[PDB]
Design a protein around this ligand. Structure first.
Ligand SMILES: O=C(CN1C(=O)C2(CCN(C(=O)c3cnc4[nH]ncc4c3)CC2)c2c1ccc(F)c2F)NCC(F)(F)F
Length: 271
């Protein structure tokens, strides 16, 4: 699998969109107003951070859904390395919904767009592992594209926690079995989608399980896996009609064989 090489000379840097530990992301304007996002790899990158970038290119070149971030081109004839995507002028869904009320048809539409992305990824057996409104990108006319910024962003540092032997994980979105056992399946992504839908219908005004703190979020994960009534669920949003709340509670059932598939979730949301 291959991609096209984009003439770097025609890019014109405008703003910085973000920073990882091992690259930048720039909003540029192409000369031949046309703007692209450029994920770069810093010229001074160790073997591991450069090979992971090449692996990132190989995996991104295969992603071909209009709700997943999509690779337009690369710069790899010489350093710095680059990947290109269409600019989304409304930022991440957390930032966009927090700015607002918006039509319920638009919210439900954005949730269906996420579900279509997630069903694509599930069809590739690509478990995304960090779905959240912070990880969605929003463009013209309320369109969505699932992305993956990594845990680097300072703005969302409070959405993440590190278990004593485990790496940092966004525990508030995760299902018990991605916490207690480390098994990230598409079911765990479906539990993620439940929390993400909840953020969409609350306008992300507050962090889920806002009443709790982290060690109580972990003890509550134990209350899910214990399945003895002491688990506490995300409350039903007022904007959210009862049936999509029943889709959400279906995402959060203790056993994965009873959670919905992304294909069925997409079908159900469209009514
Ligand atoms: O897409 C991926 C990983 N990935 C990304 O998340 C990003 C870099 C991190 N993000 C950005 O910097 C950003 C912020 N705000 C933006 N406003 N407008 C465009 C734009 C961009 C999002 C886009 C990205 C990636 C890869 C190549 C890119 F060229 C690129 F831009 N993985 C697929 C999976 F579904 F799993 F998410």
């Amino acid at each position: 699998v291959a991609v096209e090489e984009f003439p770097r000379k025609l890019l014109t840097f405008k703003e910085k969109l973000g920073e990882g530990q091992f690259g930048e992301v720039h909003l540029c304007e192409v000369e031949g107003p046309v703007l692209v996002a450029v994920k770069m790899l810093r010229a001074d990158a160790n073997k591991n951070a450069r090979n992971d970038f090449l692996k990132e290119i190989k995996i991104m070149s295969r992603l071909k859904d209009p709700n997943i971030i999509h690779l337009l081109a690369v710069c790899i004839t010489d350093d710095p390395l680059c990947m290109i995507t269409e600019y989304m002028e409304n930022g991440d869904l957390n930032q966009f919904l927090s700015r607002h009320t918006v039509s319920y048809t638009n919210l439900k539409f954005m949730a269906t767009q996420i579900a279509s992305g997630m069903k694509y990824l599930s069809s590739l057996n690509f478990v995304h592992r960090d779905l959240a409104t912070r990880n969605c990108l929003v463009g013209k006319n309320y369109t969505i594209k699932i992305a993956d910024f990594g845990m680097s962003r300072n703005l969302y540092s409070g959405d993440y926690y590190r278990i004593q032997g485990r790496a940092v994980l966004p525990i508030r979105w995760m299902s018990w079995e991605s916490i207690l056992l480390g098994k990230f399946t598409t079911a765990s992504d479906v539990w993620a989608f439940g929390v993400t839908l909840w953020e969409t219908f609350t306008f992300c005004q507050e962090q889920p399980y806002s009443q709790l703190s982290d060690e109580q979020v972990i003890e509550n994960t134990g209350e899910f896996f214990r399945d003895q009534g002491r688990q506490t669920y995300l409350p039903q949003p007022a904007i959210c009609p009862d049936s999509v709340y029943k889709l959400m509670l279906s995402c959060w059932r203790r056993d994965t064989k009873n959670r919905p598939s992304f294909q069925e979730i997409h079908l159900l949301l469209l009514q």
